Design a protein around this ligand. Sequence first.
Ligand SMILES: Nc1ncnc2c1ncn2[C@@H]1O[C@H](COP(=O)(O)OP(=O)(O)NP(=O)(O)O)[C@@H](O)[C@H]1O
Ligand SMILES: C[C@@H](O)[C@H](N)C(=O)O
Length: 329
Amino acid sequence: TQIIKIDPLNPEIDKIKIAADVIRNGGTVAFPTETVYGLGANAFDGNACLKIFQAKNRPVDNPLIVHIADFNQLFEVAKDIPDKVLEIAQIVWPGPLTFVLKKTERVPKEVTAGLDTVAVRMPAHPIALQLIRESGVPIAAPSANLATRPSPTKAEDVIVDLNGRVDVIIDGGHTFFGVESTIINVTVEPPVLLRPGPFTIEELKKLFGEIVIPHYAPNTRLLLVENRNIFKDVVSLLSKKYKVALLIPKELSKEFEGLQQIILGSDENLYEVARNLFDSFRELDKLNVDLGIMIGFPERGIGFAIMNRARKASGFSIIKAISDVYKYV
Ligand SMILES: Nc1ncnc2c1ncn2[C@@H]1O[C@H](COP(=O)(O)OP(=O)(O)NP(=O)(O)O)[C@@H](O)[C@H]1O
Ligand SMILES: C[C@@H](O)[C@H](N)C(=O)O
């Protein structure tokens, strides 16, 4: 694997070209975006895309998001797009919002998992956009991690997971949001939120008033305490019988000195928490503890995506009442 360091905000186009040549040659390139790093291949090349599944050891029926750098490309991969969706795509892209649309015959089965639809987004990251532009083709690209590990948000995460398994890894620093793009299905009416992300429910509702609102997790047991009023008592109860690691905001650090802590960021900035979430899950597994205990966060804005990933990462081991401790431990 060639690891190429490229400045994320002013990328050296010559370095981008090295990676684009690999994409055009049917190879795989891991690269940063504003959400998480993605592992990409030419979206029109089914055989190249199968290499993404092989590298991640991913079940072949879990479809891939296609990344485009301009609107001409949107029409190469999707069709029968509603006028309103097109107008909105033009104001939200490049950005962390993925649309599920009807696919064209140029999108291979390897990308869509046989579905009649294709998920597409335009990444708000200079390296991703330039990689796509120089490759001259849309790039299919799920998160760049091994199958059960948390989505990567920094180059080192990708290296640890995929070094030796992919052709190129672009080391472009830490990703901006740290959580995967919001996914909305607009082939159905009203549209449906398939995955919360950096593009908020609050904003989607202003654009799609009718929208309907319905594992990458650590291996160490992880409990999520959604009720902040019982957090201290839950920690006291559990730390008596277990070696614990607390995933918490810096504002609660002093309250728990003596116990292993994984600081997520500040309560006053949920984007900080979102940015450090997946790497905090990785840290949990590096530590040698019996269980991680994460505190809940507000669901305003990106808080909703934070909680969605946390619930899943905890295998839905949620503590809302102190007596719930009986259920999951
Ligand atoms: N045509 C589709 N219809 C419905 N959902 C789709 C479709 N295409 C892609 N998706 C979804 O997109 C998800 C993949 O997101 P993507 O970020 O490309 O890869 P990932 O690594 O699976 N994401 P994540 O699990 O958070 O790392 C799939 O697991 C589906 O949830
Ligand atoms: C790689 C990154 O773009 C991922 N596919 C997402 O949609 O967040």
